Design a protein around this ligand. Sequence first.
Ligand code: ATP
Ligand code: CL
Length: 201
Amino acid sequence: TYTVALTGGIGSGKSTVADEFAHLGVTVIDADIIARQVVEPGTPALLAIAERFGPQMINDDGSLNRRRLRERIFAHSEDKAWLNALLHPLIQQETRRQMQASTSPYLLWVVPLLVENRLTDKADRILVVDVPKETQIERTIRRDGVSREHAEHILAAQATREQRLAAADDVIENMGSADAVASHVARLHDKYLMLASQAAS
Ligand SMILES: Nc1ncnc2c1ncn2[C@@H]1O[C@H](COP(=O)(O)OP(=O)(O)OP(=O)(O)O)[C@@H](O)[C@H]1O
Ligand SMILES: [Cl-]
C-alpha cells in the first residue's frame, strides 16, 4: 500500500496533523497510540503488569498509572526487558491488524525517529511537520511540564530541523490558523491520492 511517513521533532504536532488526515479517511498508524491501547483499562497486558508489580499500577479509573510504571523501571532496569517481552508482540500484532483492515487509498505512518534511525527508504513519501525551535520548546514545556533547559536537551538528542527539512518531500508548517493547516492537509491529501493512483497503474 502507498505509504506516507510523517515525522517531526518533539512538540511539532505530528499527532495533530495526523488527526487531520484521519478525518479525511486515511488510515493512520502510530506505534505510540498502539502501545497505549494495548495497556488500556481491562486489557490482559494491564492485568499482567498489575499482577507482577501490584495494584498500585492501576488508577482508580482503571487506567495504567504510567508514572508508577516508569518509577518501577527506573529502579529495576531489568524490568524493561520484561515489559518489552509482554508488549512488543501485542504492538506488532495490532500494527499488522490495522494495516490489513485498512481500505484507504494510502497509509499515513507516524514515525518520530524517521531521520534519526535512517528509515527514509521505507515510505513512498516523507512529510515533515515543521515549527520554529522556540515553538517546539514552548509546546513541550506546556504539555510535558519540563524546564526549557530540559526541552533543549531533547532537541539536541533529535535530528536537527535542517536535517528533517532536507529529508522531506513535503513540509507542513503547523503554525498560524488551524483552518489553514487543515486546508494544507487537504491539499496534500489530494497529492497523495494522485500519487497512490500513479503507483497503482
Ligand atoms: N497549532 C498549534 N498551536 C499550539 N499548540 C499546538 C498546535 N498544534 C498542536 N499543539 C499542541 O502542541 C503539543 C504538541 O503536539 P503533538 O502532541 O501533536 O506533538 P507530536 O509532534 O505528535 O508529539 P511529540 O512532541 O511527543 O513528538 C500538544 O500539546 C498539542 O496540543
Ligand atoms: Cl509514560
